[PDB]
Amino acid sequence: LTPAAESLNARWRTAVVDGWNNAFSGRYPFKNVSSDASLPLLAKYLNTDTGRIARFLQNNLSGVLHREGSRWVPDTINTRGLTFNPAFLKAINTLSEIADVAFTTGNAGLHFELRPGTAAGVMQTTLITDNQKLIYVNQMPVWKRFTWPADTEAPGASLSWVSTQAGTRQYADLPGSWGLIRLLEMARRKAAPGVASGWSLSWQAQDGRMLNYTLRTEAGEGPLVLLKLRNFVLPETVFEL
Amino acid sequence: QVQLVESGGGLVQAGGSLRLSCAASGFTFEDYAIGWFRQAPGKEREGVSCISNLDGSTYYPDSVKGRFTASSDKAKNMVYLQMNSLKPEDTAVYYCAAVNAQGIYCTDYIIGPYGMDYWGKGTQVTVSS
Q: Give how far B44 is from chain A: nearest CA, Å.
A: 7
Q: Which residues span the domain enclosing B56?
A: 1-129
Residue of A nearest to B59 (CA): A194
Q: What is the DSSP letter of A40?
A: H
Cβ separation of B106 and A194 shorter than 8 Å? yes
Question: Following CA atoms A10, A14, A20, A23 in sequence, which dihedral angle do they give, to the nearest 10 degrees?
Answer: 150
- Alpha carbon distance A112, A129 (integer Å): 12
Q: Is A161 left (phi over 0), alpha (psi -120 to 50) or beta?
A: beta
For A182, the 3-state DSSP assignment is helix
Considering its fold, how many domains does chain B have in total?
Answer: 1
Kindly write down the DSSP assignment for every residue of A65-103, as one continuous string: EEEETTEEEE--TT-TT--B-HHHHHHHHHHHHHHHHH-
- Select the residue of A139, A195, A216 nearest B109 (Cβ to Cβ): A195
Q: Is the dihedral of CA A3, A83, A73, A102 positive or negative?
A: negative
**Short-list B122, B128, B41, B118, CA closest to B81:** B122
- Alpha carbon distance A129, A155 (integer Å): 7
Q: Which amino acid is at A62?
A: S
For residue B96, the domain's CATH number is: 2.60.40.10
The answer to whether the beta carbons of residues B96 and B35 sit under 8 Å apart is yes
Chain A residues with CB under 8 Å of a chain B CB are 115-120, 139, 141, 192-198, 200, 202, 212, 214, 216
- Alpha carbon distance A231, A29 (integer Å): 7
Kindly write down the DSSP assignment for every residue of A134-150, as one continuous string: EEE-TT----EEEEES-
Residue of B nearest to A140 (CA): B117
Contacts of B116 in chain A (CB under 8 A): 141
Cβ separation of A194 and B103 shorter than 8 Å? no
